[PDB]
Design goal:
- By secondary structure, the chain is mainly α.
- It has seven helices and two strands.
- The N and C termini lie far apart (42 Å).
- The structure holds one DNA strand of 98 nucleotides.
Amino acid sequence: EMLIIDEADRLKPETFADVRDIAEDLGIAVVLVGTDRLDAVIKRDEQVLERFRAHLRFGKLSGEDFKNTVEMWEQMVLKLPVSSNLKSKEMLRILTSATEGYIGRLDEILREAAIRSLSRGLKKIDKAVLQEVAKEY
DNA sequence: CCGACGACAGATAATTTGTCACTGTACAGTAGAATATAGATGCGCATCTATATAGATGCAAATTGAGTGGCCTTATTAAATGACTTCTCAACCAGTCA
């Protein structure tokens, strides 16, 4: 019913005729996944742009959503001996500048800061340790 | 009785609008154009590959012609046919007769 192509822009331009032929001949949905560059490649061919015109867009975290997420990370990923309470305002500002809303940097910052806290025997993250980690980016 | 504040009315420059006279300034051939870069696309030429072999060779039956080896009644007589060998192949004188 479906075929998912990650990093679609690694495809050579001619291969898209095989991708469109698959999608049209059979009852298979094809999903192309990628960055803004993908669209720069796709716009170089009407035939393809039109067979894949519909799209969904991922965005960045902000406001309450970024705030609520940092707790989900602390509870579902970090699971430390006692709570760092990283949704608190000063810890949110340090994370906001460090992460700019990308879940990736929030994932990498919080895994590194938790590993750095635990290997120093700290039961929780604190202001200076998180700034020592954030300064490396 | 004296002093201070509000109602009502009256006069007045600030504000806005309009009109009028004197004036600085653009009209004077001219900014679309030159000069780099990245990035994608297409045509050409070389540099491999994988398939496709038919010719040559080795070998193994399939007779095939040409060999070689092993097994078998005999002695007399007679006739017939066909052959071989041997031998022989004088000539005139002396005694009767019609």
